[PDB]
Design a protein around this ligand. Sequence first.
Ligand SMILES: Nc1ncnc2c1ncn2[C@H]1CC[C@@H](COP(=O)(O)OP(=O)(O)OP(=O)(O)O)O1
Ligand SMILES: [Mg+2]
Length: 598
Amino acid sequence: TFSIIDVASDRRLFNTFIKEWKTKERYSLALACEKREHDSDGLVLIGLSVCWGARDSYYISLQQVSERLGQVRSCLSRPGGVVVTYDIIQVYKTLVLSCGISLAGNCEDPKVACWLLDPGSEERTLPNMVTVYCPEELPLLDGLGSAHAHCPRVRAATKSVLVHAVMNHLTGLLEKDSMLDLFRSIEMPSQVCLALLELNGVGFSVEECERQKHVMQAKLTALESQAYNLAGHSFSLTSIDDIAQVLFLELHLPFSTTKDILEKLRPLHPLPGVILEWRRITNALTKVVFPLQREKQYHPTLAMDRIYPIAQTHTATGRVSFTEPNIQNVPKDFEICMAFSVSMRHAFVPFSGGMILAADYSQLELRVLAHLSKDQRLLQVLNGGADVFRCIAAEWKGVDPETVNDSLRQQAKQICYGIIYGMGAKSLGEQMGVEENDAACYIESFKARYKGINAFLKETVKNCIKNGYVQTLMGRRRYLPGISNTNTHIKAHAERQAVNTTVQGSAADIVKLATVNIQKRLRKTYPTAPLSHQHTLRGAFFVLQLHDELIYETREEDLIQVAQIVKREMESAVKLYVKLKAKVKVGPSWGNLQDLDL
DNA sequence: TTTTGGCTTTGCCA
Ligand SMILES: Nc1ncnc2c1ncn2[C@H]1CC[C@@H](COP(=O)(O)OP(=O)(O)OP(=O)(O)O)O1
Ligand SMILES: [Mg+2]
């Protein structure tokens, strides 16, 4: 009983369609687009299709317009008024870039619901959903175009009807899992915030990147000249096999030539040191500067180059990642003798007259573990301002806690997180530099010093065995069917994944809730500012996320007002038995952030 | 096959 009604055919018909559209609590939306590239509301975007149920879809044609566009803008922007769209980020971005309509209100997406049902599953397309969840609409799939031809109006109407049908079985599957309130309050606003982040982009100064690239090229020239001096012949260094032959075959001994093995050989003859330096710098050149120099787009209104990341937001533990040129993977500051500090994060500058504001959670997963495990000792350590990764390193090495190097603190952090996430005695011995027996004794002392952590690990494994899944703080469930396998290795891996999911998913939920709260409070504080840089410079813009940090671009007169809001919201996102401490750093660029005491 | 998450196996960010 599939029917299409062209409401944009009569003035009275359009008026009445608007009248009973504004009164609907839930509706599904789809867009019709032609074959174009980056949009127009009369050339690329053909129109919209709206469905309320019963296989009846209403199609609005934006072709040959101001009156109908205004009515559609009034209906879509704060009409319940829940709008259900497939790929909410794509739909939001397309609407904003084509007709300047921002989806204000409650949004829903069957992709997010399907991910909530099983985070470890594969990202299924809309027809793949119809075959599984709602197979009664299988005949309607004939009409969602093909590989060659597709009618935008018919495809849009069919997509709207299918999406409405799917988010009527998905909303019932999510109610029995108690994830419905979580879906409508945390995940969907997080998707809207990620869409705003993608629209904003992050500034990127080519002038700084050019200087950095010149420095790395000069360093490669110097390193190749030095290495050829040690060998006397001109051999290629990018091929691992080239190092494998001749080099380290008779000169040295352990061919699995990686970073870890040659690090132990670094105190010896400095040939491995040169190779490690060359490999690090070459990897940086290949994977950071070159990919980032081609994906930049010149924003004319801001008169600057920006990078627009693409959020992935379909992960096992709820962590939010990006696509191919991942800005989150940019290496931090390192040193080159040449000394020169290669700050690759210094190339990400804000607009003309702003500062980068990054707020970071202090030991977020440690505090989540303290709250979950009710461990008194670690909880009382994380309420007095003493750095856990510094005191642990001081006790392990014997030095004073205030005289601990940053490199030593990172090692203590790695050791602590590994032992929490089930790192074996052999791995701890190989990493911390002691024998296996001493590493096992250290693990035993760690578990007998924090009585709550061991009990939490055991109880989490037992509950994963009992229920077959692990539930985070907000209620997100990850299914691990390998927790009852007869294979010891797979069972241990499932146990480690259970603990890691239980902690990391809770941390990610806290981060997402903090992001949503910050966006709401910023909108409340600055109601006359653009939502993003593609809408029309008061407030902040949320240009990046580092799975624990929230980087914002804000003006000179708004730095303090935005920092206070961000810190307060990060602290008050959730109430736990531990204190959520977040530190705010403001600077002229991402790589030049200085702590902002406040 | 014995910290894990993301991207690409090994190294960089979480
Ligand atoms: N090796 C590891 N294994 C497991 N989880 C890890 C990890 N390294 C980091 N994480 C997780 C845990 C936390 C999350 C943030 O990563 P940060 O390195 O920034 O740790 P943070 O506690 O914030 O250290 P601080 O900022 O006080 O120096 O990444
Ligand atoms: Mg942190």
